Write a protein that binds this ligand. Structure first.
Ligand SMILES: [Ca+2]
Ligand SMILES: [Ca+2]
Ligand SMILES: [Ca+2]
Ligand SMILES: [Cl-]
Length: 194
C-alpha cells in the first residue's frame, strides 16, 4: 500500500554562500533565500523569506518546510502521484526514488533571481551531516570511497547539521554554500519520540 508521510525541514542558516551582486556602494553581496521541494511534487515547492544584503555569505532563516509525500515501504520507492482518485496531481503511480531538493538563490528586485547552488538528497541513501559549518565540505558527498557516510533517513527518522551546496563549473563541482538543517520524516500516527 501507499503510506502518507511528511518531510519536516527546518532551514536554520546558510554560510559561505556565493555573492552574486555588487551593492550600490560596490560591495559583493547576495539576497539569500532557500527553495525546497520533493522530486515528483514540484507543485508543493516552498521557499524561505529572504536574508537581504548578505555581505559574508551568511543567512539566518529558522524556517520550517513541510513536504507531504506517498511512499511504498516494501519497494522503498516514491509514487509521484498523490493519493486516491485521478483528480490528484501526478495521476497514478510512476515509481521514483524519494529525493528532496534544496536550492540557494539570490533575490533581485530589478532582474530575475539568480541560482547560486543546490543539494539533492536521496531519503534512502543520504550523506551524514557535519556537526559544524567548518567541518562541512564536499567530501561529505563521497559515495564512492566512504559509503559508510551515507545513510537512510527512514531508519534514522531525524538528522541535523550542515550539508554543502554545489554549483557545476561544467563537469567540475564547486562549493556554493553550506546549509544548516534539521530533517525529519514524520508518520501520520506514531510515538512522539523513539
Ligand atoms: Ca543578482
Ligand atoms: Ca540580489
Ligand atoms: Ca539577476
Ligand atoms: Cl536587483
Amino acid at each position: 500500500m501507499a503510506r502518507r508521510f511528511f518531510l519536516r525541514c527546518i532551514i536554520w542558516n546558510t554560510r559561505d554562500v556565493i555573492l552574486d551582486d555588487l551593492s550600490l556602494t560596490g560591495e559583493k553581496m547576495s539576497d539569500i533565500y532557500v527553495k525546497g521541494w520533493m522530486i515528483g511534487f514540484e507543485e508543493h515547492k516552498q521557499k524561505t523569506d529572504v536574508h537581504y544584503r548578505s555581505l559574508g555569505g551568511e543567512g539566518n532563516f529558522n524556517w520550517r518546510f513541510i513536504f507531504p509525500f506517498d511512499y511504498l515501504p516494501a519497494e522503498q520507492v516514491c509514487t509521484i502521484a498523490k493519493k486516491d482518485a485521478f483528480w490528484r496531481l501526478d495521476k497514478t503511480e510512476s515509481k521514483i526514488p524519494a529525493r528532496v531538493v534544496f536550492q540557494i538563490w539570490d533575490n533581485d528586485k530589478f532582474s530575475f533571481d539568480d541560482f547560486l547552488g543546490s543539494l539533492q538528497l536521496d531519503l534512502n541513501r543520504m550523506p551524514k551531516p557535519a556537526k559544524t559549518a567548518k567541518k562541512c565540505s564536499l567530501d561529505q558527498l563521497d559515495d564512492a570511497f566512504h559509503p559508510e557516510w551515507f545513510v537512510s533517513l527512514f531508519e534514522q527518522k531525524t538528522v541535523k547539521g550542515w550539508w554543502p551546496c554545489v554549483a557545476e563549473e561544467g563537469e567540475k563541482k564547486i562549493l556554493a554554500g553550506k546549509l544548516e538543517m534539521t530533517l525529519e520524516i514524520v508518520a501520520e500516527s506514531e510515538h512522539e519520540e523513539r
